[PDB]
Design a protein around this nucleic acid. Sequence first.
DNA 1: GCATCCGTGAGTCGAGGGTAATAAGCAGGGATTCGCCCGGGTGTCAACTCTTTTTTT
Lengths: 49, 103, 59
Amino acid sequence: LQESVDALFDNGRRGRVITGANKRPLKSLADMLKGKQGRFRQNLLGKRV
Amino acid sequence: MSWTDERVSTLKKLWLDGLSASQIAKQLGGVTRNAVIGKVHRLGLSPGSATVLTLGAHMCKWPIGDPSSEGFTFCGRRSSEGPYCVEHARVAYQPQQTKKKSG
Amino acid sequence: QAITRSIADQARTIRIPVHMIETINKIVRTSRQMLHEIGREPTPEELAEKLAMPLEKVR
DNA sequence: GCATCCGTGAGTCGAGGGTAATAAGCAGGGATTCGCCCGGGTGTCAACTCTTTTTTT
Ligand SMILES: [Zn+2]
């Protein structure tokens, strides 16, 4: 349970949690705001017009 | 069967006081099993040297005999750091432990 | 029983009853057997008569 | 006071479009859900009486 909790937030510090169907690693809340969907260039600074 | 004002009252009473739902329709008469369930759902409100008592810590616990028999006791000897005794530790556990795998 | 009863509840990602999943497994097994020992591919029309179920249910 | 080991980075706009695998069984009891039907509140109409602005006398 503790592993699931602290992997739901980052998913990178501990062992990687990969779904059985998809071969790509899951994107937790921390990874969602770093480079892909964070405020770097996706939503906050750079957006469609 | 009927669904008068008294039919719902007796049904609610018999469902509240406690009774098998299958026999509820038979006791009321006429109403089937499916009708009473729909009504309650629609309307809502649904030998050794120690016995089994004088067994202290650090003592043997290997049973001897039958528990449902007259005389059933344990060894009760110096058997610290283990549930069973040294004389039975080699007969209870797997003798000659040889197991290994990958890790 | 504990491993099979729990694998069909949490791993599916959606609420699927046990009778539904067992019927799905039986239908898949019979379809594979018919496709392997009858012809090219079993049609859903004959799957109802083979399993003795209505067409609306098998569909 | 140094030697060894674990995090961050990598430009930017455009094209291209959908995906994919394993598979027990049956008996008990309840909760759920789909068909029919009586029904009472909402519409859509024949059909009986005051007012009055003239248009006729
Ligand atoms: Zn003993």
